Design a protein around this ligand. Structure first.
Ligand SMILES: *[C@@H]1O[C@H](CO)[C@@H](O)[C@H](O)[C@H]1NC(C)=O
Lengths: 116, 50, 45, 50, 50
């Protein structure tokens, strides 16, 4: 019925984060996830999507991530590796069902990363 | 690309309130006329909101 | 014969039309069923 | 901030089929008493005629 | 018998030609008129007439 996105804490460059998009639903395995990226005040963009059989990343996160599925929980999760200070964005996650087109858009999580 | 298709059936549909309310910038009907909608009983109606 | 099963995947991924025959109810629950390999109904003898 | 012409428009399409099934979506057209043996302008579910 | 059958076939074809759209939305004049306003139903009536 809805999606909530929680996480996106304060970490260091090169660290690992664990962001989960738990969905209020009962067939979210069919509702494949898409991750979207928005810069702090600049134009939006996508990140990744585990559309069941295979995956698809973006140019900024090409292969650097380990996208994961939680089909037994109907939840999605993204693994963040080789994080950079230039990826300071607000990641999203969305899924649209096959039947009766509809959106379960979330809220967003900060991707603030320090540089030194 | 995820247009919401809703099933409308087994109810009385009053299209006059939609037609007379000029809040819409484009109320176009192709196979019928908007003024005559209040005299036809329809087999099945689809609503596609997006 | 007690009914028929319909669908496209029959593994709870997609919708599945289902029909059962009974003396009282003929429920046609259109749900997402994680169907078994051998859906069968047993009657004592 | 963008000018008129790019702003979001809420679009709803009322697709429907006529005469091809038992009609379930009737207009707010009040029923009248039935008459027999006289040439009349009948209107059954949209099947108008004389 | 051939004379009778020729006349019957001619009348049957002439009657069955009343069920052809000729490009109109419907092959029934009453439903065309009851569904569309006159200004746009003009062309459908014209196709049926032709
Ligand atoms: C029909 O179903 C009811 C319960 O849904 C059951 O009590 C009844 O025995 C069934 N009729 C049969 C098995 O003939």
């Amino acid at each position: 019925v809805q999606l909530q996105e929680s996480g996106g804490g304060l970490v260091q460059a090169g660290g690992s984060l664990r962001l989960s998009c738990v969905a209020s639903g009962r067939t979210f395995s069919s509702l494949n996830i898409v991750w979207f990226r928005q810069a702090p005040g600049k134009e939006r963009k996508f990140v990744a999507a585990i559309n069941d059989r295979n995956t698809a990343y973006a140019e900024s996160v090409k292969g650097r991530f380990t996208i994961s599925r939680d089909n037994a929980k109907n939840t999605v999760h993204l693994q963040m590796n080789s994080l950079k200070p230039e990826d300071t964005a607000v990641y999203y996650c969305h899924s649209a069902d096959v039947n009766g087109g509809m959106d379960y858009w979330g809220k967003g999580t900060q991707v603030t990363v320090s540089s030194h | 690309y995820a247009w919401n298709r809703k099933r409308i059936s087994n109810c009385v549909a009053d299209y006059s309130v939609l037609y007379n309310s000029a809040s819409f910038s484009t109320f176009k009907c192709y196979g019928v006329s908007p003024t005559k909608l209040n005299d036809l009983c329809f087999t099945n109606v689809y609503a596609d909101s997006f | 014969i007690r009914g028929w099963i319909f669908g496209t995947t029959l593994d709870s991924k997609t919708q599945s039309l289902l029909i059962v025959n009974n003396a009282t109810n003929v429920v046609i629950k259109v749900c997402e069923f994680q169907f078994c390999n051998d859906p069968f109904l047993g009657v004592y003898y | 901030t963008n000018g008129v012409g790019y702003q979001p428009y809420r679009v709803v399409v009322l697709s429907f089929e006529l005469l091809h099934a038992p009609a379930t979506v009737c207009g707010p057209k009040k029923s009248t008493n039935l008459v027999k043996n006289k040439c009349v302008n009948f209107n059954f579910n949209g099947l108008t005629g004389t | 018998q051939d004379v009778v059958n020729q006349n019957a076939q001619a009348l049957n074809t002439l009657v069955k030609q009343l069920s052809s759209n000729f490009g109109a939305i419907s092959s029934v004049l009453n439903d065309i008129l009851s569904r569309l306003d006159p200004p746009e139903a003009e062309v459908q009536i014209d196709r049926l007439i032709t």
